[PDB]
Amino acid sequence: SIKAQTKVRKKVMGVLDIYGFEIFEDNSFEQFIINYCNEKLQQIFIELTLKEEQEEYIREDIEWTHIDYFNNAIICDLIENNTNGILAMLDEECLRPGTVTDETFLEKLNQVCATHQHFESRMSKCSRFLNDTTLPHSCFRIQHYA
Amino acid sequence: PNYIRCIKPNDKKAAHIFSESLVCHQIRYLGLLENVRVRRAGYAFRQAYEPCLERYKMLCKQTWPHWKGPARSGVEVLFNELEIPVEEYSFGRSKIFIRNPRTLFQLEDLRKQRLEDLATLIQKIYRGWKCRTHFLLMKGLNDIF
Amino acid sequence: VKSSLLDNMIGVGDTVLLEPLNEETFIDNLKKRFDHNEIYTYIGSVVISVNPYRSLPIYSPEKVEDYRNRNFYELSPHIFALSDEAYRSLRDQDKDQCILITGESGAGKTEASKLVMSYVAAVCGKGAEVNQVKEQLLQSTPVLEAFGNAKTVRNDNSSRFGKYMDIEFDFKGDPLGGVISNYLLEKSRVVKQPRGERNFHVFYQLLSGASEELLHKLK
Amino acid sequence: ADQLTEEQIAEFKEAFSLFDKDGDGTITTKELGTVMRSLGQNPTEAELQDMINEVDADGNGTIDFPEFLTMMARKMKDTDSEEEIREAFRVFDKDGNGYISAAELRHVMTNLGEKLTDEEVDEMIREADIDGDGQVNYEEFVQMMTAK
């Protein structure tokens, strides 16, 4: 009803009513997608704000200095990557033939995400969280910004 | 991107009930602390020269009472007369820059006391204007007191 | 303009100006400002809202004219200053804007989007042609929140998808329209609820709300 | 100073004799600056207590007339400028367009400075703008108060 039929050149202000970050008692795949899109929002947000500050200081000929903060782009990559990302591995596990369980998917994540800094599981091969008694089996941790 | 955080204070849907722990969970969830850092950089605060000289023209005895243009020249002798160290602030073409926020606390404190001095400067002229009115009425009534 | 944020300040209105920065002093700041009933606090140019679960007179149309085309930092913190900075960045500088609103379910996001829509429809001054779009979105919100939102463990109702709204203008300021765009429907809640949670509301409204001839009609 | 000739001393004697209701050639502390503000010199209350405490080592506030002439000689040309007063009203403007909201001004004038009383600030709102209400203009008001 309210969309213009004409193809004329226009301007736009949009609003995005979307969730915040979530930690439940029991987190599953839907919370993995929810937290993923949160990681994307934080990534593009802090990146564009950083460019905004560098523009404001490059106008006034003021030297920018680097300041340390959490990088979301390592996290997003961990889920996004087409060759070892967690959605690519679960897409593969839904595609690859054979016995496909949840245990074999968690073992695949223990195989192809061990040498990643921000992946955290007990049965990972490079694990410094093996003797971490607070990590139950049939679970894993992701080091989000929260 | 312009951006809105939303914080839930309680689970009881009440008005006056505040819980520190639930809000602390939502500070961690939303990442308010990491939102501070990108605006919290090498200069933590900045202004433009015109509302800065409008803001602090009463702390500088050269700008007092009016005004004084150009704005960068009056802001410059403002920070010169207040003898804040040159490390603490920085000049631009169209912006003044404040590195640490404690200078912004201090300058607003000193301005806040000069507001009281302006109130004294008003009230003595108002009350002395009432006494000038009374002496003006009684002066035109008699040849001698 | 000589007026600033630092007048009429309870606590500090900006987290950027907060000395020592941790969680704890920030909880002190939000508890002070919320107990003194000032529910907006910035981070740079970022709005922080806390839900008071009640009406405050900061949304009167008299209060709108206090805020209109005053700059961002010049006055006390409120949600309208961000929409005024965006509306001046769009109107005067021709830069298309978007406001991302994130937070907990029940923390006041949807209402804030409604208030930004009402504020822009007020300050554009285009009458029934913008109030048809505003009436469309505001009267379409309980529909979308009935279909796509459901009860979780933590909340009685929760945003299980992202609502989006395009607010489309002419160069002259005439409203050319707007587009709702959904994102990320949690699909597996349709077919498998988790324990203690709930499937999407329209099934429970459909079963509990219908007459017996409608339930016998829908089999 | 040098100090004052007979003409200005006899000019001061008229307000000094106006507030001499008993006819004794001296007055007390709380009515002492009312003569100086009646004649247009206008010191503050705080520096008035400085002038009283300057010559009194006893602490009762008994002031003689030649020291009173010295107080008036220090504040003869110490009267403050009109534009300085005008800017001092320009600071308390709400929008930068030449007015003050009346309730905020009533809150300032009864909490900062030498604390004008209840009838004096209610008088001040009506002297500033008799038409009302809740908003006072001060462009004519300062021109009326600064003229001697």
Ligand SMILES: Nc1ncnc2c1ncn2[C@@H]1O[C@H](COP(=O)(O)OP(=O)(O)O)[C@@H](O)[C@H]1O
């Ligand atoms: N800014 C606000 N002012 C007044 N009430 C609010 C505000 N934000 C939220 N509320 C209250 O919260 C309830 C709905 O909030 P909502 O926006 O749906 O939260 P969420 O978007 O997190 O689900 C309403 O009943 C409303 O009274």
Ligand SMILES: [Mg+2]
């Ligand atoms: Mg909502």
